[PDB]
Swiss-Prot record:
This is Zinc finger protein 28 homolog. The gene is ZFP28. It comes from Homo sapiens (Human). May be involved in transcriptional regulation. May have a role in embryonic development. Belongs to the krueppel C2H2-type zinc-finger protein family. A zinc finger (C2H2-type) spans 13-35. It is found in: Nucleus. It comes from the Eukaryota.
């Protein structure tokens, strides 16, 4: 018996920094900005 059905409106463009979301990329980009600035690792992802 494994029960557990729920939903909080998911999306393809989710933010794993604060907990936000968007519909298109442009929207997500303009956001990530507030996140882009620190120095987590040496070089950049790509
Ligand atoms: Zn965010």
């Amino acid at each position: 018996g494994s029960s557990g059905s729920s939903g909080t409106g998911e999306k393809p463009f989710e933010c794993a920094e604060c907990g936000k979301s968007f519909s298109i990329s442009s929207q997500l980009a303009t956001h990530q900005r507030i996140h882009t600035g620190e120095k987590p690792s040496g070089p950049s992802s790509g």
